[PDB]
């Protein structure tokens with residue numbers, strides 16, 4: 337997360353760190369007692385042996401894994417979206433099963449899915465979080481980073497990303513001036529929007545042109561388009 341700040345303990349109890357080979361590579365979002373939503377590209381090429389992935393729930397700081405609020409879980413099933421296209425980056429979403437269920441605490445809670453036509457309108461501030469790089473091509477965060485980013489229209493996002501195919505399966509967020517954005521290591525994590533004092537998983541952190549550049553927004557897989565598919569696992 338570029339231009340964010342340190343999240344407090346228990347700020348985003350749905351945020352999950354995904355470890356492969358003892359390295360935190362991607363984020364994820366807890367959506368039930370045993371299912372995570374993440375990005376397909378995180379797990380592409382590494383889904384045949386799901387027990388190579390470890391989810392750390394209730395994580396705040398990577399340098400304090402052994403604290404009472406954290407819970408580790410091996411993944412025993414990974415289901416990439418059947419319409420995932422690697423080259424075009426479309427439908428960049430995946431389901432990941434926890435081998436054993438988690439009990440909910442102040443630090444571990446599921447995030448609500450959107451309603452199937454739910455509108456998170458352009459100009460509204462939503463939130464992002466993760467342990468990814470803090471500047472483009474820089475170092476990873478120790479403490480979980482958070483930031484607020486305003487949503488774009490898909491038309492405006494397409495104009496700003498003419499080298500990419502911005503589809504209806506994507507939602508974009510970023511500042512005109514840059515400075516605040518997701519980055520490498522944050523993918524698979526949430527874009528969360530609040531409405532009526534309830535947080536909703538509006539997006540899954542997917543891609544962009546570098547990070548934090550002016551008029552180069554974060555592109556997120558639009559979760560409302562996959563609600564029905566996600567709900568079939570729960």
Ligand SMILES: *C(=O)c1ccc(NC(=N)N)cc1
Pocket residue numbers: 517518519520521522523524541542543544545546547548552553554555
């Ligand atoms: C995921 O690893 C990821 C997410 C977002 C970006 N870039 C921008 N949002 N600009 C890169 C990589």
